[PDB]
Amino acid sequence: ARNVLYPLYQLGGPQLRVFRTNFFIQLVRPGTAQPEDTVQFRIPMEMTRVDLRNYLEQIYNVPVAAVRTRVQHGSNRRRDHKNVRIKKPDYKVAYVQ
Amino acid sequence: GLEEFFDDPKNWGEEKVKSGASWTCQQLRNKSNEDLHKLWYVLLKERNMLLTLEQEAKRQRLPMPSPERLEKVVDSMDNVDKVVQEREDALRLLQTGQEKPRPGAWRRDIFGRIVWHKFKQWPIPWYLNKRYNRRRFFAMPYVDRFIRLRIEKHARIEARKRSLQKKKEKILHAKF
Amino acid sequence: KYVVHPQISALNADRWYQSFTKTVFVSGLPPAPSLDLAALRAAVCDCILQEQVYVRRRRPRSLFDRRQALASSILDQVVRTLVNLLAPLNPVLSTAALDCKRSVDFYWLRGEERIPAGHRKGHIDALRYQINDKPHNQIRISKQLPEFVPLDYSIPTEIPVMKCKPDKLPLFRRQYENSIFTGSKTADPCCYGHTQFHLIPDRLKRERLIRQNQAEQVEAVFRANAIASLFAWTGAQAMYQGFWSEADVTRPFVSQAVITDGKYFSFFCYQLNTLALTVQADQNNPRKNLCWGSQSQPLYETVEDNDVKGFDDGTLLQIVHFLLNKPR
Amino acid sequence: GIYTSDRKFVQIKEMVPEFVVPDLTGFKLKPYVNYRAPAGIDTPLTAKALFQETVAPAIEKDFKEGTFDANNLEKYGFEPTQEGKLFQLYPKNFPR
Amino acid sequence: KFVSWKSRTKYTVKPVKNYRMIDFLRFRPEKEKAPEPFEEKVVVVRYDPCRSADIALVAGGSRKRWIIATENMKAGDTILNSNHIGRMAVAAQEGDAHPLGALPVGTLINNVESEPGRGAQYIRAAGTCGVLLRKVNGTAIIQLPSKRQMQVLESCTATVGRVSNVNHNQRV
Amino acid sequence: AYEWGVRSTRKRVYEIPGLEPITYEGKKHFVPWLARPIFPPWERGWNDPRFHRAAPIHEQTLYKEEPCYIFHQRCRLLEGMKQALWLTKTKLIEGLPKKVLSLVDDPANHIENQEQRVLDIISHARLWHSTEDIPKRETYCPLIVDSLIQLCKSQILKHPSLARRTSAQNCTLATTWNRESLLLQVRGTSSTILSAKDPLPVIASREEVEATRSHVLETFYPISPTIDLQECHVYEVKDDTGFQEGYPYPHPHTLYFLEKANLRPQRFLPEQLRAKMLLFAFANALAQARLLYGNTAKVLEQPIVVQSVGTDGRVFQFLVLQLNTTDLASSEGVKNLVWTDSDQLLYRHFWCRPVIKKKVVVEPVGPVDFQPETFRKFLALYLHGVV
RNA sequence: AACUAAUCCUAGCCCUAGCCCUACAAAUAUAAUUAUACUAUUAUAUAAAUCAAAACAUUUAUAAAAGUAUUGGAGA
RNA sequence: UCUCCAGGCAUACGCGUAUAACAACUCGGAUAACCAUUGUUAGUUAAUCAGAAUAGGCAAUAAUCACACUAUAAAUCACCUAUAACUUCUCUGUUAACCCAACACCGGAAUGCCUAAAGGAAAGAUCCAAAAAGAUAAAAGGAAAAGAA
RNA sequence: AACUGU
Known part of the structure; x- marks a missing residue:
């Protein structure tokens, strides 16, 4: 779930369960050379690597061994006709073994 | 599974993939609460697979087969959410009568405007929260000048649009 | 320069470390005075009881x-x-x-x-x-x-x-x-x-690794630490003798190490044959480093009251055998 | 998780969302619908419709029988408070 | 961005980041003592960066406290602090704290307080000595370094002897 | 007295009866135009350690009116030796026990190349052990003692009976006793305690123990015996020997203490170190007597002997203590006997790097004024009770 | 008949009339826009001067009766 | 491959995609080649590297290889006694030939290691004008070497 | 004084 408020948890509160997930992920061909088990994924910036492990293991029943994630800075050099800088949306690349 | 992230191997390389119309709101309403929850994931799974294919297509600089499929899924997902929300909204009013899921009230900002303030969850009460009290919900005396400008600005806006309309009317007279 | 951790959680790190070290890891031990074996068991059993049940220390x-x-x-x-x-x-x-x-x-x-x-x-x-x-x-x-x-x-x-x-x-x-x-x-x-x-x-211990689903990595963790630690320790010893990349060791350098998770015990033996790992120094080198390792084995089962249960002499015998070894 | 003193991270299991994935086996609904299937006119659900469908039949039966009183509003489905339910309608205590 | 540096809660003899907390109320009953005469030992004569005169560490019982050093104060000397008003002349060791009633007329004093309990505020500079011009009953006359003669109650504490650097006032 | 602290930083509608003034409580935020509400106590519903405050001492169930004075490692006695003797009701005999000196006189006890091995140990403990050019006392001081123990640890070959003792780490010793109606407690921990299956031989005969009645504890009036001790009102009566009951080695042989602080101001003076050893060593001896003979107050028929060694890595202090009586309530009567050896210098100075002036090595990389006798005294204590 | 250039009509505005007004999520005054505790939280005295009096000083506007009676370095 | 030159590499700070591949040849580099330009696509992976409970009790003695040894500019929480909590690995930073000076400005720019193994190129072509500037050389003499006041 | 294309 993204762009939403999660219920505040205090001692004795229920476990946080997301019955419907707003996180959307896409598998991308690795730009760099990676081990075959390693897989690249583009995921929302608010998702944690643990969530991806739970997401793949639960929704897709995919077993995961290790995860490495990076945040790519979007280029803002481009400008429009009005001289307003255009920013490429920042995305996170996840390396899932 | 990983195969679910990708389209049917047979469909790979095809110009398009045959797909029907998106779920309408009325049909989703007929479906049960449990059915609605399951359908959300089914639409979500298709949406993710289409997103994965589209991203690869952009990398390969190739056209996406049947792009309307993603649009249909998104519309169905949006229809599902409102139908579920409608049931949630109806029950909330019945049991509590509150017209908004989140506590809120109308408050005056430091600029003199009246805006709906959405309440936030805190572990301590407001009076024991100095930072929340530090937040200003009162208008300074100098805002009186701004209030007059707002009334004048609103009057000015009406004049400007009328002037804008007059210029458009010139086109009608000029053309005919 | 790359920073190498002797104990690491990386998948298949044992193979990667061997490539970086030019070491061959052969499964098992390297090819090959009474002391009242029972007496040692009691002595070792007492030592475990002393700290766990007898010593008093601040929590x-x-x-x-x-x-x-x-x-x-x-x-x-x-x-x-x-x-x-x-x-x-x-x-x-x-x-x-x-x-x-x-x-x-x-x-x-x-x-x-x-x-x-x-x-x-x-x-x-x-x-x-x-x-x-x-x-x-x-x-x-x-x-x-x-x-x-x-x-x-x-x-x-x-x-x-x-x-x-x-x-x-x-x-x-x-x-x-x-x-x-x-x-x-x-x-x-x-x-x-x-x-x-x-x-x-503890992070790499069997219990957490099984929970993390990396049960197979337990042996990999043993192998990576043994190969990295022994090679560095043996390589440093050879350099103390004046042998470096352009002056390879004239005599094989051998050492052994034991890696334990607190209950299980493993035995590893390393022999250093080559100090020339650079492209120029390793341009013509047929020699390679050889490492021998053994699977981890429990030394004892549990501590009950003031008597330890399940002590395994077989692991102790390997320690006794290792300790009794001396140069000829 | 929570960052306590000494700059140490301590993950809290309860605050970590758990994805509840329904079983899609036996579910007849798919991402798309037939063009052969006629579309249904949108009829958004409202409190009036919800009350009529669920609460009205009970009261109508009870009113004719005469077994109706103000004290038993909870009997017909009124909730005095949202506390005790995992999902509270107001204030909202669950994520989408 | 200005925060007062004189915010040390606990009195200590160790230099404070250095500043050494001086005590100008000589007769402050230390730990495990009644408000009766007590004695202290001059451990060391140190140098005070913030004052012209040199400060001598005076310690007694379980309390150690910095004080101003008199003309003849030296390391290892013994300093007495008495609240009792002596019926006869009280044995005077330079640096000792005694009521003006105890001392006899003509004795050089320093670190005097204008009002009982006020604390030493004058004759705190090097070479400054107060002369007891007159003594009658519960009132005494002490000449301050400004040459202003003031009359105070005998309860006020006076330390015998001149301040260190006896020739400070004679500087050219 | 000069006043410290800048002065800048120094610190209707309600009365109307039958009605309640309006307040911004409903607004949930402060506004100057509404009255300040009076808020009732807030209930969190759970305990937050970050905002929790400890309950007062007096409300504690363990609070006791009588003051219990606790001596710990950091405690520094104002009177030093004199206070320790009065608190422990012990009589001091100058020099180590005659038996201890004779241990090293045995040729078999003497180590082969003892001076050379000790010199190598000193060099190893100071320079070779670590990669740093000049290691600090916080590092080498623990190591030198262990290395010397290791050198003695090799003597088990000569004496198989040495296998009957082992050393434990971070053991805690504590006892409570009364002196002239004053409640005294000693708390000691850390270091290493060597324990053997058999008690150390008694140093003083029963006749000598009876003679101690003549000795009178020195007093330091008006300073109270409890000066420099931590006065505690919430305490428990406990006796600790460093091990749980049933330990195979119930008899403690030696009690070590290490002062590894690099800076001299951070290092306790030799007199204070011995005073700490006396109280800590006395507590361990007292704990053994109380366990064996109970909490009753009486002269011990079989005295208990305890040894303590304290060193900072350069200066070594050797202590041997014999507990003769547990009737410590009175200040007169049978007294314990303690043997003290102080200011045993292993070496005057050590250089971890060569001192070169004008291309001349003025000082080598080795101990200066090395005294092998200090190790012999250390060796004598370790071997005592076996040879 | 030539290159550089040039050509265009509305983009819109202005003055009166009329008219008072009452027009997503998420995050935010903490360091605004930082999903939960810190740290309590807060504007404003005649308007003056410039200017006019050719400087400058009291002074200097901001329906008819009538610019009359009056006031003013009786002067602007 | 040859000739020759000799502050290089990391981090901080700052910058914010200038990074890398492909395709273009119009604009930008004060010319080309080639890109630093134009368009499109890709990129920087961290449990180890970096950033993001409370109440009492109690403290004399610098460092300098810290020992001797002196000195003056005067130079360091801990640990005890109680109370409270009770099983944890997420988030963020990671590219570059880069910054402050209107500029691809002969300017300014902290720390650590090391001094060539790292890092580089003064020659757009031709001519050898005068005049001018810089550098080297001087027969005989020495104001027409480094010594004194 | 020497020194030198001053």
Whole structure:
């Protein structure tokens, strides 16, 4: 779930369960050379690597061994006709073994 | 599974993939609460697979087969959410009568405007929260000048649009 | 230069480490005075009971290091007592030097890489690696251990070759002082080694690894630590003798190490045959490093009341056999 | 998780969301619908419709029988408070 | 960004980041003592960066406290602090704290307080000595370094002897 | 007295009866135009350690009116030796026990190349052990003692009976006793305690123990015996020997203490170190007597002997203590006997790097004024009770 | 008949009349836009001067009766 | 491959995609080649590297290889006694030939290691004008060497 | 004084 408020948890509160997930992920061909088990994924910036492990293991029943994630800075050099800088949306690349 | 992230191997390389119309709101309403929850994931799974294919297509600089499929899924997902929300909204009013899921009230900002303030969850009460009290919900005396400008600005806006309309009317007279 | 952790959670790190070290890991042990075996069991059994049930000490504040702290205390007590009991049988133990949680460092070069971009784009630079290890305990002697196999020994097995770059597997490079250290300075008379003792952290212990689903990595963790620690320790010893990349060792350098998770115990033996790992120095080298390792085995089962249950003599016999070994 | 003193991270299991994935086996609904299937006119659900469908039949039966009183509003489905339910309508205590 | 540096809660003899907390109320009953005469030992004569005169560490019982050093104060000397008003002349050791009633007329004093309990505020500079011009019943006349003669109650504490650097006032 | 602290930083509608003034409580935020509400106590519903405050001492169930004075490692006695003797009701005999000196006189006890091995140990403990050019006392001081113990640890070959003792780490010793109606407690921990299956031989005969009645504890009036001790009102009566009951080695042989602080101001003076050893060593001896003979107050028929060694890595202090009586309530009567050896210098100074002036090595990399006798005294204590 | 150039009509505005007005999520005054505790939280005295009096000083506007009676370095 | 030159590499700070591949040849580099330009696509992976409970009790003695040894500019929480909590690995930073000076400005720009193994190129072509500037050389003499006041 | 294309 993204762009939403999660219920505040205090001692004795229920476990946080997301019955419907707003996180959307896409598998991308690795730009760099990676081990075959390693897989690249583009995921929302608010998702944690643990969530991806739970997401793949639960929704897709995919077993995961290790995860490495990076945040790519979007280029803002481009400008429009009005001289307003255009920013490429920042995305996170996840390396899932 | 990983195969679910990708389209049917047979469909790979095809110009398009045959797909029907998106779920309408009325049909989703007929479906049960449990059915609605399951359908959300089914639409979500298709949406993710289409997103994965589209991203690869952009990398390969190739056209996406049947792009309307993603649009249909998104519309169905949006229809599902409102139908579920409608049931949630109806029950909330019945049991509590509150017209908004989140506590809120109308408050005056430091600029003199009246805006709906959405309440936030805190572990301590407001009076024991100095930072929340530090937040200003009162208008300074100098805002009186701004209030007059707002009334004048609103009057000015009406004049400007009328002037804008007059210029458009010139086109009608000029053309005919 | 790449920073190498002797204990690491990286998947298949054992194969990657062997490629970086040019070491072949053969499964099992290297090819090959009564002391009342029962008496040692009682002595070791008492040592475990002393710390766990008899000693009185301030409770740790963290409450998480308690399990780790207990394992360190029992291991230290057992080792110290065992040396005295086995010292009369093996005079080497009397003259040996025991090191407690001291650092062993080795710096070696294997392979090369081409700069992909920047003001130095296209220039060729060597792949640098550094290993810093602090074995729980290690024994240093002034005489080389007996060789387990003649130098130039050849086996059909081939060292692993890594297709991807080292960085692709989690690994980061940093620029700092390069150090080669045997556990003591060159002035120390004990320039050779008897044995190393390693303690795996709780994160890599069997219980957490099984929960993490990396059950198969338990043996990999044992292999990676043994190969990295022994190679660095053995390589540093050879350098103390003046042997370097352009002057390869004339005599095989051999050492052994034991890695324990607190209950299970594993035994590893390493033989160093080549100090030439650079492209130029390794341009024409048929020799390779050979490592022998054994699976981890429990030493005892549980501590009940003031009597330990399930103590395994077989693991102790290997320690006794290892301790009794001496140069000929 | 929570960052406590000494700059140490301590993950809290309860605050970590758990993805409840329904079983799609036996579910007849798919991402798309037939063009052969006629579309249904949108009829958004409202409190009036919800009350009529669920609460009205009970009261109508009870009113004719005469077994109706103000004290038993909870009997017909009124909730005095949202506390005790995992999902509270107001204030909202669950994520989408 | 200005925060007062004189915010040390606990009195200590160790230099404070250095500043040494001086005590100008000489007769402050130390720990495990009644408000009766007590004695202290001059441990060391140190140098005070923030004052012209040199401070001598005076310690007694379980309390150690810095004080101003008199003309003849030296390391290892013994300093007495008495609240009792002597019926006869009280034995005077330079640096000792005694009521003006105890001392006889003509004795050089320093670190005097204008009002009982006020604390030493004058004759705190190097070479400054107060002369007891007159003594009658519960009132005494003390000449301050400004040459202003003031009359105070005998309860006020006076330290015998001149301040260190006896020739400070004679500087050219 | 000069006043410290800048003065800048120094510190209707309601009365109307039958009605309640309006307040911004409903607004949930402060506004100057509404009255300040009076808020009732807030209830969190759970306990937050970050905002929790400890309950007062007096409300504790363990609070006791009588003051219990606790002596710990950091405690520094104002009177030093004199206070320790009064608190422990012990009589001091100058020099180590005659038996202890005779231990090293045995040729078999003497180590082969003892001076050379000790010199190598000193060099190893100071320079070779670590990669740093000049290691600090915080590092080498623990190591030198262990290395010397290791050198003695090799003597088990000569004497198999030495296998009957082992050393434990971070053991805690504590006892509570009364002196002239004053409640005294000693708390000691850390270091290493060597324990053997058999009690150390008694140093003083029963006749000598009876003679101690003549000795009178020195007093330091008006300073109270409890000066420099931590006065505690919430305490428990406990006796600790460093091990749980049933330990195979119930008899403690030696009690070590290490002062590894690099800076001299951070290092306790030799007199204070011995005073700490006396109280800590006395507590361990007292704990053994109380366990064996109970909490009753009486002269011990079989005295208990305890040894303590304190060193900072350069200065070594050797202590031997014999507990003769547990009737410590009175200040007169049978008294314990303690043997003290102080200011045993292993070496005057050590250089971890060569001192070169004008291309001349003025000082070598080795101990200066090395005294092998200090190790012999250390060796004598370790071997005592076996040979 | 030539290159550089040039050509265009509305973009919109202005003055009166009329008219008072009452027009997503998420995050935010902490360091605004930082999903939960810190740290309590807060504007404003005649308007003056410039200017006019050719400087400058009291002074200097801001329906008819009538610019009359009056006031003013009786002067602007 | 040859000739020759000799501050290089990391981090901080700042910059914010200038990074890398491909495709273009119009604009930008004060010319080309080639890109630093134009368009498109890709990129920087961290449990180890870096950033993001409370109440009482009690403290005399610098460092300088710290020992001797002196000195003056005067130079370091801990640990005890109680109370409270009770099983944890997420988030963020990671590219570059890069910054402050209107500029691809002969300017300014901290720390650590090391001094060539790292890092580089003064020659757009031709002519050899005068005049001018810089550098080297001087027969005989020495105001037409480094010594004194 | 020497020194030198001053």
